[PDB]
Coordinates of C-alpha atoms and ligand atoms in Angstrom, one line a residue:
Chain O
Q1317 CA -25.6 19.0 -20.1
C1318 CA -23.9 16.2 -18.2
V1319 CA -20.2 15.3 -18.3
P1320 CA -19.4 11.7 -19.5
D1321 CA -16.3 9.4 -19.1
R1322 CA -15.6 10.6 -15.5
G1323 CA -15.1 14.1 -17.0
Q1324 CA -11.8 13.0 -18.7
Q1325 CA -13.0 15.1 -21.6
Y1326 CA -13.9 18.3 -19.9
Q1327 CA -12.7 21.7 -21.0
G1328 CA -14.5 24.0 -18.7
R1329 CA -13.6 26.9 -16.5
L1330 CA -14.3 25.6 -13.0
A1331 CA -11.6 26.6 -10.5
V1332 CA -13.0 25.9 -7.1
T1333 CA -13.4 22.7 -5.1
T1334 CA -16.6 21.4 -3.6
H1335 CA -15.5 22.9 -0.2
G1336 CA -15.2 26.3 -1.9
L1337 CA -11.4 26.3 -2.0
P1338 CA -9.7 27.9 -5.1
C1339 CA -7.6 25.6 -7.3
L1340 CA -3.9 26.2 -7.4
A1341 CA -2.3 26.7 -10.8
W1342 CA -1.5 23.4 -12.5
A1343 CA 1.7 25.1 -13.7
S1344 CA 2.5 26.3 -10.2
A1345 CA 5.7 25.2 -8.5
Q1346 CA 4.0 23.4 -5.5
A1347 CA 1.5 21.8 -7.9
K1348 CA 4.4 20.6 -10.0
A1349 CA 6.2 19.0 -7.1
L1350 CA 3.0 16.9 -6.3
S1351 CA 2.6 16.0 -10.1
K1352 CA 6.3 15.0 -10.3
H1353 CA 5.9 11.2 -9.7
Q1354 CA 2.3 10.7 -10.8
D1355 CA 0.9 9.0 -14.0
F1356 CA -0.8 11.6 -16.2
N1357 CA -2.9 11.0 -19.3
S1358 CA -1.8 13.2 -22.3
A1359 CA -5.3 13.6 -23.8
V1360 CA -5.9 15.8 -20.6
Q1361 CA -4.9 19.3 -20.9
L1362 CA -3.8 20.9 -17.5
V1363 CA -5.0 24.4 -18.3
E1364 CA -4.5 27.2 -15.8
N1365 CA -6.1 26.2 -12.5
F1366 CA -9.2 24.3 -14.0
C1367 CA -10.7 21.1 -12.6
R1368 CA -9.2 18.2 -14.5
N1369 CA -9.0 14.4 -14.2
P1370 CA -5.4 13.6 -15.4
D1371 CA -5.1 10.3 -13.6
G1372 CA -8.4 8.9 -14.4
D1373 CA -9.7 9.1 -10.8
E1374 CA -13.1 7.2 -10.5
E1375 CA -14.4 10.4 -8.8
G1376 CA -13.9 12.7 -11.7
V1377 CA -12.2 16.0 -11.9
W1378 CA -10.2 17.7 -9.0
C1379 CA -7.5 20.2 -8.5
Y1380 CA -4.7 20.9 -6.0
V1381 CA -5.6 23.4 -3.1
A1382 CA -2.2 23.7 -1.5
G1383 CA 1.3 22.1 -1.5
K1384 CA 1.3 19.1 0.9
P1385 CA 0.2 15.5 0.4
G1386 CA -3.5 15.2 0.4
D1387 CA -4.2 19.0 -0.3
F1388 CA -6.5 18.5 -3.3
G1389 CA -10.2 18.4 -3.8
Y1390 CA -12.9 17.3 -6.2
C1391 CA -15.0 19.8 -8.2
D1392 CA -18.7 19.4 -8.2
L1393 CA -19.5 18.8 -11.9
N1394 CA -22.6 17.0 -13.0
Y1395 CA -21.7 13.6 -14.3
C1396 CA -23.8 11.1 -16.3
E1397 CA -25.5 7.9 -15.2
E1398 CA -22.7 5.7 -16.6
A1399 CA -24.1 2.2 -15.5
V1400 CA -21.1 -0.2 -15.3
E1401 CA -18.8 -1.4 -12.4
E1402 CA -15.3 -3.1 -11.8
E1403 CA -15.1 -6.5 -9.8
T1404 CA -12.1 -8.2 -8.0
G1405 CA -10.6 -9.2 -11.4
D1406 CA -11.8 -6.4 -13.8
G1407 CA -10.1 -2.9 -13.7
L1408 CA -7.0 -2.6 -15.9
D1409 CA -5.1 0.7 -16.6
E1410 CA -1.3 0.5 -17.9
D1411 CA 1.1 -0.3 -15.0
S1412 CA 4.9 -1.2 -14.8
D1413 CA 6.0 -0.3 -18.3
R1414 CA 7.1 2.7 -20.3
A1415 CA 6.1 2.6 -23.9
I1416 CA 4.7 -1.0 -24.7
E1417 CA 8.1 -2.7 -24.6
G1418 CA 7.6 -6.4 -25.4
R1419 CA 11.2 -7.4 -25.7
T1420 CA 12.2 -9.6 -22.7
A1421 CA 13.7 -12.8 -23.9
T1422 CA 15.9 -14.3 -21.0
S1423 CA 13.3 -14.1 -18.1
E1424 CA 9.6 -14.9 -17.6
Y1425 CA 8.1 -12.8 -14.9
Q1426 CA 9.4 -9.5 -16.0
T1427 CA 11.1 -7.8 -13.0
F1428 CA 11.0 -4.1 -13.0
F1429 CA 13.4 -1.4 -11.3
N1430 CA 16.8 -1.2 -12.9
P1431 CA 20.1 -2.5 -11.1
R1432 CA 22.1 0.6 -9.9
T1433 CA 20.7 2.1 -6.7
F1434 CA 17.1 1.0 -7.2
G1435 CA 19.0 -0.9 -4.8
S1436 CA 19.4 -4.6 -4.8
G1437 CA 16.9 -7.3 -3.7
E1438 CA 15.0 -7.9 -6.9
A1439 CA 16.0 -11.3 -8.4
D1440 CA 15.6 -13.0 -5.1
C1441 CA 12.8 -11.0 -3.4
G1442 CA 9.9 -12.9 -1.9
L1443 CA 11.9 -16.1 -1.4
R1444 CA 12.5 -16.7 2.2
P1445 CA 16.0 -18.0 3.4
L1446 CA 14.5 -20.3 6.1
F1447 CA 11.7 -21.6 3.9
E1448 CA 11.7 -21.4 0.2
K1449 CA 15.5 -21.5 -0.1
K1450 CA 15.8 -24.5 2.3
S1451 CA 12.8 -26.2 0.7
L1452 CA 10.8 -26.0 3.9
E1453 CA 7.0 -25.2 4.2
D1454 CA 5.7 -23.0 7.0
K1455 CA 2.9 -24.3 9.2
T1456 CA 0.0 -22.5 7.4
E1457 CA 0.9 -21.6 3.9
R1458 CA -0.9 -24.7 2.7
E1459 CA -4.0 -22.9 3.6
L1460 CA -3.2 -20.2 1.1
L1461 CA -2.4 -22.5 -1.9
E1462 CA -5.5 -24.5 -1.2
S1463 CA -7.6 -21.4 -1.5
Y1464 CA -6.6 -21.1 -5.2
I1465 CA -7.4 -24.6 -6.1
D1466 CA -11.0 -25.1 -4.7
Chain J
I844 CA -3.9 -8.9 14.7
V845 CA -7.0 -10.3 16.1
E846 CA -7.3 -14.1 16.1
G847 CA -4.0 -14.7 14.6
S848 CA -1.0 -16.9 15.9
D849 CA 2.7 -16.4 16.7
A850 CA 4.8 -16.2 13.6
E851 CA 7.5 -18.7 13.1
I852 CA 11.1 -17.4 13.0
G853 CA 12.0 -16.0 9.5
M854 CA 8.4 -16.5 8.3
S855 CA 8.0 -12.9 7.3
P856 CA 11.6 -11.6 6.6
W857 CA 10.4 -8.4 5.0
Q858 CA 8.4 -7.4 8.0
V859 CA 9.7 -4.0 9.3
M860 CA 8.8 -2.1 12.6
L861 CA 8.7 1.7 12.4
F862 CA 9.7 3.1 15.6
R863 CA 9.6 6.5 17.3
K864 CA 13.1 7.6 18.7
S865 CA 11.6 9.4 21.6
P866 CA 9.5 8.5 23.4
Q867 CA 10.5 5.0 22.3
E868 CA 7.4 3.6 20.8
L869 CA 6.2 1.3 18.0
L870 CA 4.3 3.3 15.4
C871 CA 3.4 0.9 12.7
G872 CA 4.6 -1.9 10.5
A873 CA 6.2 -1.5 7.1
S874 CA 7.9 -3.9 4.5
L875 CA 11.3 -4.1 3.0
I876 CA 11.2 -4.1 -0.8
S877 CA 15.0 -3.6 -1.4
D878 CA 18.2 -3.3 0.3
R879 CA 17.4 0.5 1.0
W880 CA 13.7 1.0 0.3
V881 CA 10.8 0.5 2.7
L882 CA 7.0 0.5 2.0
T883 CA 4.4 1.8 4.5
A884 CA 1.0 3.3 4.9
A885 CA 1.0 7.2 4.7
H886 CA -1.2 7.6 7.7
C887 CA 1.6 6.1 9.9
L888 CA 3.6 9.2 9.1
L889 CA 1.0 11.9 8.4
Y890 CA -2.5 12.2 9.7
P891 CA -3.3 15.8 10.7
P892 CA -6.6 14.9 12.5
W893 CA -4.5 13.2 15.1
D894 CA -1.8 15.9 14.9
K895 CA 0.6 13.4 13.3
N896 CA 3.5 14.5 11.1
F897 CA 6.7 12.4 11.5
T898 CA 9.8 13.6 9.6
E899 CA 13.0 11.5 8.8
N900 CA 14.8 12.2 12.1
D901 CA 11.8 11.2 14.2
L902 CA 11.9 7.6 13.2
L903 CA 13.8 4.3 13.0
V904 CA 13.2 1.3 10.9
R905 CA 13.9 -2.0 12.6
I906 CA 14.2 -5.0 10.4
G907 CA 14.6 -8.8 11.1
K908 CA 12.5 -8.5 14.3
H909 CA 10.2 -11.2 16.0
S910 CA 9.9 -9.9 19.6
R911 CA 7.8 -6.7 19.9
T912 CA 9.9 -5.3 22.6
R913 CA 13.1 -7.0 23.2
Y914 CA 16.2 -5.4 21.5
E915 CA 17.2 -8.3 19.3
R916 CA 20.9 -7.5 19.0
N917 CA 22.8 -9.4 16.1
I918 CA 19.5 -10.6 14.5
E919 CA 17.6 -7.2 13.8
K920 CA 19.0 -4.2 12.0
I921 CA 18.2 -0.6 12.9
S922 CA 18.4 1.9 10.0
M923 CA 18.0 5.7 10.0
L924 CA 15.9 7.4 7.4
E925 CA 17.3 9.4 4.4
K926 CA 14.0 10.5 2.8
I927 CA 10.1 10.0 3.1
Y928 CA 7.8 10.1 0.2
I929 CA 4.1 10.2 0.8
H930 CA 1.7 9.7 -2.1
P931 CA 0.9 13.3 -3.3
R932 CA -2.8 12.4 -3.4
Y933 CA -3.0 10.3 -0.2
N934 CA -6.6 11.5 0.7
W935 CA -6.4 11.8 4.4
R936 CA -9.3 14.3 4.6
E937 CA -11.7 11.8 3.3
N938 CA -11.1 8.0 3.3
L939 CA -7.3 7.4 3.3
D940 CA -7.4 6.8 -0.6
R941 CA -3.8 6.0 -1.8
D942 CA -2.6 5.2 1.8
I943 CA 1.0 4.6 0.8
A944 CA 4.4 6.0 1.5
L945 CA 8.0 5.0 0.7
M946 CA 11.1 5.5 2.9
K947 CA 14.7 5.6 1.7
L948 CA 17.2 4.2 4.1
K949 CA 20.4 6.1 5.1
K950 CA 22.5 3.2 4.0
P951 CA 21.7 -0.1 2.3
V952 CA 21.1 -3.1 4.7
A953 CA 22.7 -6.6 4.4
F954 CA 20.2 -9.5 3.9
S955 CA 20.3 -12.5 6.3
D956 CA 18.1 -15.5 7.3
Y957 CA 15.8 -13.0 9.0
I958 CA 16.1 -9.9 6.6
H959 CA 14.9 -10.3 3.1
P960 CA 12.7 -8.2 0.7
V961 CA 9.2 -9.1 -0.5
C962 CA 8.3 -9.0 -4.2
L963 CA 5.9 -6.5 -5.8
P964 CA 3.3 -7.8 -8.1
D965 CA 3.3 -7.6 -12.0
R966 CA 0.0 -7.1 -13.8
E967 CA -0.3 -10.8 -14.5
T968 CA 0.4 -11.8 -10.9
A969 CA -2.2 -9.3 -9.6
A970 CA -4.8 -10.4 -12.2
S971 CA -4.5 -14.0 -11.2
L972 CA -4.1 -13.8 -7.4
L973 CA -6.2 -10.8 -6.5
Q974 CA -9.6 -12.7 -6.6
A975 CA -12.4 -13.1 -4.0
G976 CA -12.1 -16.3 -2.0
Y977 CA -8.2 -16.4 -2.4
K978 CA -6.4 -15.9 0.9
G979 CA -3.3 -13.7 1.8
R980 CA -1.5 -13.3 5.0
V981 CA -1.2 -10.3 7.2
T982 CA 1.4 -9.8 9.9
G983 CA 2.1 -7.2 12.7
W984 CA 2.6 -6.2 16.4
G985 CA -0.8 -4.3 16.6
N986 CA -3.5 -4.8 19.1
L987 CA -4.9 -8.3 19.9
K988 CA -8.5 -7.0 20.3
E989 CA -10.6 -4.0 19.5
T990 CA -10.5 -3.0 23.1
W991 CA -6.8 -3.5 24.0
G992 CA -3.4 -6.9 24.5
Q993 CA -0.1 -6.2 22.9
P994 CA 1.5 -9.4 21.6
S995 CA 4.8 -10.5 22.9
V996 CA 5.9 -11.6 19.4
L997 CA 5.0 -10.9 15.8
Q998 CA 1.5 -12.2 14.9
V999 CA 0.3 -13.6 11.7
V1000 CA -3.2 -14.3 10.2
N1001 CA -4.6 -15.7 6.9
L1002 CA -7.7 -14.0 5.5
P1003 CA -9.6 -14.3 2.2
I1004 CA -10.2 -11.5 -0.2
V1005 CA -13.8 -10.3 -0.3
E1006 CA -15.9 -9.3 -3.4
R1007 CA -16.1 -5.6 -4.0
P1008 CA -19.8 -5.2 -3.7
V1009 CA -19.6 -6.9 -0.2
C1010 CA -16.9 -4.5 0.8
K1011 CA -18.8 -1.5 -0.4
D1012 CA -22.0 -2.4 1.5
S1013 CA -20.1 -3.1 4.7
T1014 CA -19.2 0.5 5.3
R1015 CA -20.4 4.1 4.8
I1016 CA -16.8 5.1 4.1
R1017 CA -16.2 5.6 0.3
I1018 CA -14.2 2.7 -1.1
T1019 CA -12.0 3.0 -4.2
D1020 CA -10.2 1.1 -6.9
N1021 CA -7.0 1.9 -4.8
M1022 CA -8.3 -0.4 -1.9
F1023 CA -9.4 -4.0 -1.5
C1024 CA -10.8 -5.8 1.5
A1025 CA -10.3 -9.1 3.3
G1026 CA -11.6 -11.1 6.1
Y1027 CA -14.2 -13.8 6.7
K1028 CA -18.0 -13.4 6.3
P1029 CA -20.3 -13.9 9.3
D1030 CA -21.4 -17.4 8.9
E1031 CA -18.1 -18.5 7.4
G1032 CA -17.1 -19.5 11.0
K1033 CA -13.5 -18.5 11.1
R1034 CA -12.4 -15.0 12.4
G1035 CA -9.4 -12.6 12.0
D1036 CA -8.5 -9.1 11.2
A1037 CA -5.7 -6.6 11.3
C1038 CA -6.2 -3.8 14.1
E1039 CA -4.7 -0.5 15.1
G1040 CA -0.8 -0.7 15.2
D1041 CA -0.8 -3.1 12.2
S1042 CA -1.0 -0.4 9.7
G1043 CA 1.7 -0.3 7.2
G1044 CA 2.3 -4.1 7.4
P1045 CA 2.1 -6.2 4.2
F1046 CA -0.8 -8.4 2.9
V1047 CA 1.1 -11.0 1.0
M1048 CA 0.1 -13.9 -1.3
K1049 CA 2.4 -16.8 -2.2
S1050 CA 2.3 -17.4 -5.9
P1051 CA 1.5 -20.9 -7.2
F1052 CA 3.3 -20.3 -10.4
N1053 CA 6.7 -19.4 -9.1
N1054 CA 6.3 -19.8 -5.3
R1055 CA 7.5 -16.3 -4.5
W1056 CA 5.7 -14.1 -1.9
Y1057 CA 4.1 -11.0 -3.4
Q1058 CA 3.0 -8.0 -1.4
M1059 CA -0.5 -7.2 -2.9
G1060 CA -1.7 -4.9 0.1
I1061 CA -0.8 -2.6 2.9
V1062 CA -2.8 -2.6 6.1
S1063 CA -4.8 0.7 5.9
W1064 CA -8.1 1.0 7.7
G1065 CA -11.1 -0.7 9.4
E1066 CA -14.0 0.2 11.7
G1067 CA -13.1 -1.7 15.1
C1068 CA -11.4 -4.9 14.5
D1069 CA -12.9 -8.4 13.8
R1070 CA -16.6 -7.2 14.0
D1071 CA -19.0 -9.5 12.2
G1072 CA -20.0 -7.9 8.9
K1073 CA -17.0 -5.6 8.8
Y1074 CA -13.7 -6.2 6.7
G1075 CA -10.2 -4.8 6.9
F1076 CA -9.1 -2.5 4.1
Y1077 CA -5.7 -2.6 2.4
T1078 CA -4.0 -0.3 -0.1
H1079 CA -4.0 -1.9 -3.5
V1080 CA -0.2 -2.1 -4.1
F1081 CA -0.3 -3.0 -7.8
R1082 CA -2.6 -0.1 -8.7
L1083 CA 0.0 2.3 -7.2
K1084 CA 3.0 0.5 -8.6
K1085 CA 3.8 3.3 -11.3
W1086 CA 4.1 5.9 -8.5
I1087 CA 6.5 3.5 -6.6
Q1088 CA 8.7 2.9 -9.6
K1089 CA 8.8 6.6 -10.5
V1090 CA 9.7 7.7 -7.0
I1091 CA 12.5 5.0 -6.9
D1092 CA 13.8 5.6 -10.5
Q1093 CA 13.8 9.4 -10.2
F1094 CA 15.9 9.4 -6.9
Ligands
DFK2165 C1 -2.8 3.3 11.0 C2 -3.3 1.8 11.2 O1 -2.7 1.1 12.2 C3 -4.9 1.6 11.3 C4 -5.2 0.1 10.8 C5 -6.6 -0.3 11.4 C6 -6.9 -1.6 10.6 N1 -8.1 -2.1 11.2 C7 -8.8 -3.1 10.8 N2 -8.3 -4.0 9.8 N3 -9.9 -3.5 11.4 N4 -5.6 2.6 10.5 C8 -6.3 3.5 11.1 O2 -6.5 3.6 12.3 C9 -7.0 4.5 10.2 C10 -6.2 5.7 10.2 C11 -7.1 6.9 10.5 C12 -8.3 6.3 11.0 N5 -8.4 4.9 10.7 C13 -9.3 4.1 10.7 O3 -9.2 2.9 10.3 C14 -10.6 4.5 11.1 N6 -11.2 3.7 12.1 C15 -11.6 4.4 10.1 C16 -11.3 5.7 9.0 C17 -11.0 5.4 7.7 C18 -10.8 6.4 6.8 C19 -10.7 7.7 7.3 C20 -11.0 8.0 8.6 C21 -11.3 7.0 9.5
LIG2166 C1 4.9 18.4 8.8 O1 6.0 19.1 9.5 C2 6.9 20.1 8.9 C3 7.6 20.9 10.0 O2 8.9 20.5 10.1 C4 6.0 20.9 8.0 O3 7.0 21.7 7.1 C5 6.6 23.1 7.0 O4 6.4 23.5 5.6 C6 5.8 24.8 5.6 C7 5.1 25.1 4.2 O5 5.9 24.5 3.2 C8 6.8 25.8 6.0 O6 6.3 27.1 6.0 C9 7.3 25.6 7.5 O7 8.4 26.5 7.8 C10 7.6 24.1 7.7 N1 7.6 23.9 9.1 C11 8.6 24.1 10.0 C12 8.5 25.3 10.9 O8 9.5 23.3 10.1 C13 5.0 20.3 7.3 O9 4.0 21.4 6.7 C14 4.0 19.5 8.2 N2 2.9 18.9 7.5 C15 1.7 19.2 7.6 C16 0.7 18.7 6.8 O10 1.2 19.9 8.6
NA2167 NA1 -15.3 -9.1 10.2

């Protein structure tokens, strides 16, 4: 009757967006270009041109409608009441790994993109030559650090 | 930036100005995340409702700047663009969900006292810093008031992160997990906001654990500037970090 879990399990036939546009084929070239750098959940089967929710969009299922950024649309499925919400330190979802690594035993931040042409910047980023590197404070950063404490 | 102050020299060395070749014109801000990649807001490059669609040859990135208008030869570096990547699901038709873009520079740039990249958050940094009440800093050369004042020099303002239910109720526009909001509440006394022309610029937080500056947001959108009961909205950078890494690694 109603779809649960933001329609992440949903196996239906719907192939038209709320704006009556026809879903492009998930297997299509232009749809694959757009999928190329995205983070898709395997338990979500990209069948044909059917409204699916691969990325776990809070808004539910959707499909591409054409080949440029932003050319997609949600599909009007009837979802369930699902009474819960995320607050400023709540919503997770796996981010900045590959396959639960763990091994990182000569550094304790875990910096990310690999050193070839990722390019360079990483080890030192976010430390200012005229401030952190000189041991000087800028005139208003104290305001920021104090907001953490009280 | 409304109700901000002039930046100090080298205070935000990752700040980038995106600039139209012809006619010569500031478009937006941006941030340097490495020697050859720049982060910005997608709507600075692509917003069909305003007939806006800039390609690589239309634009310049200018790094190390302070003056809005002066050509700061020997301090600033001007780089051409190799490639633009707009988030494939940047939702311009609705609410600017996933308002983010990456730009690859023609050649890497050398760092200096004035030119230096910002860090991107890890999950742990994002979890501890991204909380209501905590302040981050926003910079840019955008309007000084809702009803324009262009600044002569880079502006900076410190603003607190706002609870999500308060963000949600402040606007009719649909807010998502890919955004957060910041600014003072009416009856908190202090004022401040980003404005048009500031889009793309970084919302940054200085970590108490390692003292590095992390870019947590990108100036995205708002309704006016500095209105009571309204808050600026920022692209949640961590929540789109996987897309950032994938674009960069697959290059
Ligand atoms: C492109 C950016 O310079 C600018 C930033 C405004 C930030 N304002 C405040 N913090 N107060 N963004 C915009 O101008 C965006 C781009 C399209 C329209 N827009 C808006 O902010 C609109 N006023 C509201 C809006 C949001 C989402 C969709 C359509 C309109
Ligand atoms: C932004 O501008 C470029 C124009 O250079 C557009 O690229 C076009 O892509 C379409 C469809 O893939 C082609 O048929 C055209 O030949 C290209 N245009 C031309 C003549 O250069 C791009 O579509 C524009 N973006 C948007 C959303 O309008
Ligand atoms: Na306000």
